[PDB]
């Protein structure tokens, strides 16, 4: 678990947002497995506006913080679940590095903010969804 506290926004991953979420929804889209919902309080974060391929990421199940380099953000294959179905998810940037279920929501960072949270992983890979995009997270 986790999210990106920005202004008045909050976003988290798709299928781990709650009924406050989708009842002050803003934007989402299953095929990046993102979800932005309003809030009344300023947000926390930062966001990078950038091309960086280095950063660093919250690791939930290690409890500890590790640095990676990851792809540019492009379109991945992801199995079903309580959640989805074979789909290439969109705007995912991978990395070698460790993740197990209940490590989505870690942000990854880099000089210049926060890049994006961790979606996917698997067989010494992590998979993390961009918001570098979302321009209109800070306007
Ligand atoms: N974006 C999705 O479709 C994810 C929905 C939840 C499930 N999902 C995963 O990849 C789950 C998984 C499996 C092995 C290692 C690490 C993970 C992690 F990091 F939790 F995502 C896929
Ligand atoms: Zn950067």
Not at 44 to 56: F, H, K, L, S
Not at 60 to 84: D, G, N, Q, T, W
Not at 106 to 114: D, K, N, S, T
Request: proline content about 3%; glycine content about 10%; some cysteine.
């Amino acid at each position: 678990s986790g999210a990106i506290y920005v202004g008045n926004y909050r976003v988290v991953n798709r299928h781990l947002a709650t009924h406050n979420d989708w009842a002050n929804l803003v934007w989402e889209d299953s095929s990046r497995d993102l979800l932005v919902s309003s809030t009344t309080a300023q947000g926390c974060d930062t966001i990078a506006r950038c091309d960086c391929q280095t950063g660093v990421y919250y690791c939930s199940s290690r409890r500890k913080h590790y640095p990676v380099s990851f792809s540019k953000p492009s379109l991945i294959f992801v199995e079903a679940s309580e959640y989805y179905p074979a789909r290439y998810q969109s705007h995912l940037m991978l990395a070698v590095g460790h993740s197990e279920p209940g490590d989505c929501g870690g942000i990854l960072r880099c000089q210049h903010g926060v890049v994006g949270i961790v979606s996917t992983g698997g067989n010494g890979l992590v998979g993390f969804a961009d918001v570098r995009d979302l321009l209109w997270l800070d306007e």
